[PDB]
Amino acid sequence: SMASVAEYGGEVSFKYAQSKGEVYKEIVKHVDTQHGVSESTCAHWIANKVSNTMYEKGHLKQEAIDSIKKLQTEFMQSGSATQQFKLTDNWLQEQGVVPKEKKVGDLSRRDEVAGTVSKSDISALTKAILDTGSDTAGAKKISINLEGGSHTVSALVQGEKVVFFDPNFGEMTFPSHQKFESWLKEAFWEKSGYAGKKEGKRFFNVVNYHA
């Protein structure tokens, strides 16, 4: 967003009539909302299989949809990913689903398998899904992270003058480094959708050209 540029002592030089940034924020909201529905639906599917169908062509029963919507809302309004996944786990135990435990030395701990996937390797994920440990049978709730996109912005710095250009919003000018730095950190980073919801490092690369 560029609502705050003038508040931080900058000027908007150009504003795109159709903000591809606003489209990106709607995409983030969509993918976030759809995670809630996916998590809630998988929880309901797991509870249904371990206790006999949730299906009505190509739709869930209305009572399943109402219950999925309820859990999804609660899931969404839980803060951290840790609290969200704890809320779904509590719901599953309330429905009589029993989480597996494993021994690590003498101690009982949750039978969760954490790991990594990539474009070219899902071997560890596949083994975690297929493993039933001591038993012949198991239900799994599988959380997977999706690839984020790539974005390019540009800047011209001339002494204390900073021109910042985001093809998703437009062009802004700040008359000092400090005014640009405060605006970028305190206004733009969150409001833009580039910050994300989770903690975690993402790469950046700056290529420098002569002015």
Window 137 to 166, contacts with Na ion (CB under 5 A): 163
- The secondary structure of 125-136 as a DSSP string is HHHHHH--TTSS
Binder of its own copies out of 100, 175, 179, 191 (CB under 8 A): 100
With tokens 């839980």, the residue in question is 78
Specify whether the CB–CB gap between 99 and 109 falls below 8 A: no
**Three-class HEC string of 23-80:** HHHHHHHHHHHHHHHHHHHHHHHHHHHCCCCCECCCCECHHHHHHHHHHHHHHHHCCC
CB of 7 to its own copies, least distance (A): 18
Binder of its own copies out of 175, 179, 184, 191 (CB under 8 A): 184
CB of 105 to its own copies, least distance (A): 19
Q: How many residues does the chain have?
A: 211
CB of 99 to its own copies, least distance (A): 6
**Which one of Na ion, its own copies, none is in contact with 52 (Cβ closer than 5 to 8 A by kind)?**
none
Based on the shown chain and the rule CB under 8 A, indicate whether residue 76 belongs to the binding site for its own copies.
Answer: no
Based on the shown chain and the rule CB under 8 A, indicate whether residue 152 belongs to the binding site for its own copies.
Answer: yes
Q: Which residues bind Na ion (CB under 5 A)?
A: 13, 163, 173
